[PDB]
């Protein structure tokens, strides 16, 4: 399909490919894109199939599809980029670093989906394995409580009112998410590029222990995990940590350029 793709800035320090999460879109990352451009990076943004300004039934895609999109972006750029992904997008960039290990300069994962939420019952995981096979196009609610996204009430309100944000997830995408969560841990030793993981300690959408386990599972030496005490799933707009969170990402990318 014809996706929504956009390039921002001049890639004096290289490229950073931005990979958004489930139900959102790349337009929510204007602040980070501006900061990265200001530091000398180009940013390549896209909206997943079924998300944002891209076409397709809402929420109907897969982690594998996103990785193929990343393949295409790296072919277009003609050089190794950094990857930045959040939530579903954080899981995706970790899986990309595992399955295309020599194609990137490094990977930054914000709240990557590496552990099941306690709000997601175990039978829902088993159901997704079935529905992903027999009714892959079936569209269901993602179960997300927006109040769990951020300690910033205005950020939560914006998310709710954003017309590009949706709560759909297909059977195919649900199956892909839980399957790739498992594989992300099993294949952790395949990563060769430097890694930065960023988590909020109060995140129950993607429990931080998933990142903590991954950090220990990684074999690459240049690995870093940063915790933000009290932050929810989205640290970007957190009142206490939003600015620091942005700064850590930029500083890490600058130091690895
Ligand atoms: C498809 C069968 C039922 C699937 C619905 C279960 C909800 C899955 C929530 C996925 C959340 C992944 N996330 C947002 C943390 O990245």
Residue numbers in the entry: 1 to 257
From the paper:
The crystallographic analysis of a lipase from Palaeococcus ferrophilus (PFL) previously annotated as a lysophospholipase revealed high structural conservation with other monoglyceride lipases, in particular in the lid domain and substrate binding pockets. In agreement with this observation, PFL was shown to be active on various monoacylglycerols. Many lipases have evolved to contain a so-called cap domain, which, in MGLs, consists in an insertion after the β6 sheet of the α/β hydrolase core domain and participates in the substrate recognition or serves as a lid to control the access to the active site. The ligand binding pocket is lined by well-conserved residues, which explains the PFL substrate preference for monoacylglycerols compared to other lipids, particularly lysophospholipids.
Despite a limited sequence identity with hMGL or mtMGL, PFL displays a high level of structural conservation with these enzymes. The proposed glycerol exit route is locked by Leu144, which corresponds to the gatekeeper residue Ile179 in hMGL and lies in an intermediate state between the open and closed states of the human enzyme. A comparison of the van der Waals surface of the crystal structure of PFL, and a closed structure observed for the PFL-G system, allows emphasizing the partial opening of the crystal structure (respectively). Figure S5A also reports that the lid of the crystal structure of PFL is seen as partially open when a spherical probe with a radius size of up to 2.1 Å only is used, while the residues Leu144 and His166 delineate a very small aperture toward the alcohol-binding pocket that is not accessible to the solvent. The H5 helix, which constitutes the core of the cap, its hinges, but also the H7 and H8 helices, located at the close vicinity, are the most flexible parts of the enzyme. Nevertheless, micellar concentrations of LDAO impede the association of the dimer toward higher oligomeric forms and allow the crystallization of the enzyme. Indeed, crystals of PFL could not be obtained in the absence of LDAO or, on the contrary, in the presence of MAFP, which suggests that this inhibitor stabilizes an alternate conformation compared to the crystal form. Particularly, the Ser117–Ile204 hydrogen bond is observed in the presence of the LDAO ligand, and Asn142 can play a closure function even at high temperature. In the present study, we highlight Phe123 as a residue is involved in the closure of the PFL lid, which mirrors the corresponding pulling residue identified earlier for the hMGL. The high flexibility and closure propensity of the lid observed in the MD study, even in the presence of LDAO, could constitute indications that the crystal packing contributes at least in part to the stabilization of the conformational state highlighted in the experimental structure.
